[PDB]
Write a protein that binds this ligand. Structure first.
Ligand code: CA
Length: 124
């Protein structure tokens, strides 16, 4: 049995630059050492998508030993809007537990509080 949520480690903020490519990394651990990689995503609040203003945000997940490795990458178009956005690494263990639920992401967005796996995406 597994009732404990996986834990994301992600940089608190990632800064990207118009016209330029970027690459950052997050990792995930879980008590069971077993994951649901296809249900581990990088997304904005509203839907399982990179989000408005950040449609160029990409990711790829692999399992390395007992961890997931989440590569967060892309190329920022030269005419993207400059600003700061909250995004979420949402990981699922093999048993279906998630680090942050849809409910929690919504409360965090409105209340300006934090969940595990959240990060600031800063465009300059
Ligand atoms: Ca677990």
């Amino acid at each position: 049995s597994d009732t404990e949520r996986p834990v994301v480690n992600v940089p608190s903020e990632i800064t990207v630059y118009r016209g330029e490519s970027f690459e950052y990394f997050a990792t995930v651990t879980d008590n069971s050492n077993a994951f649901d990689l296809a249900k581990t995503v990088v997304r904005w609040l509203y839907s399982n998508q990179p989000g408005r203003g950040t449609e160029w945000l990409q990711y790829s997940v692999t399992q390395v030993g007992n961890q997931l490795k989440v590569r967060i990458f892309g190329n920022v178009p030269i005419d993207t809007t400059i600003g700061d956005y909250t995004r979420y690494v949402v990981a699922t263990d093999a048993a279906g537990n998630v680090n942050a639920t849809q409910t929690e992401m919504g409360n965090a967005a409105v209340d300006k509080t934090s969940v595990n796996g959240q990060f600031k995406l800063i465009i300059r």
